[PDB]
């Protein structure tokens, strides 16, 4: 009886994998979003350099 | 202050340069090779590309 009913009152929770896998894409998500405004604002500076320093 | 006739010298030899900077007075062909040469140089350190407008990006999601 103990055996079962812990092994319900666990298996109630299995949602923990899932609740990572939507963190773990909300965040690789946000690292794309990063790179992205990174990766624009350094080419900018990038030909803004090249200019100042000719 | 008036006095200083290398002080006004260098001065009026100032104002000439100034005059006849139309184009590098007395450039010789080294003004020319070394601002080809550091150009070159810089073109190389920072990119290759579009250096006129902004290039686009064209990114790839996840």
Do not use: C, W
């Amino acid at each position: 009886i103990d055996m079962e009913k812990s092994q319900q009152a666990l298996v109630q929770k299995r949602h923990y994998l899932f609740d990572v896998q939507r963190n773990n894409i909300a965040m690789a998500l946000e690292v794309t979003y990063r790179e992205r405004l990174h990766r624009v604002y350094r080419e900018v500076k990038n030909r803004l350099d090249y200019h100042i320093s000719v | 202050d008036p006095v200083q006739k290398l002080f006004v010298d260098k001065i009026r030899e100032y104002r000439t340069k100034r005059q006849t900077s139309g184009g590098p007075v007395d450039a010789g062909p080294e003004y020319q090779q070394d601002l080809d040469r550091e150009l070159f140089k810089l073109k190389q350190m920072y990119g290759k590309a579009d250096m006129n407008t902004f290039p686009n990006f064209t990114f790839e999601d996840p």
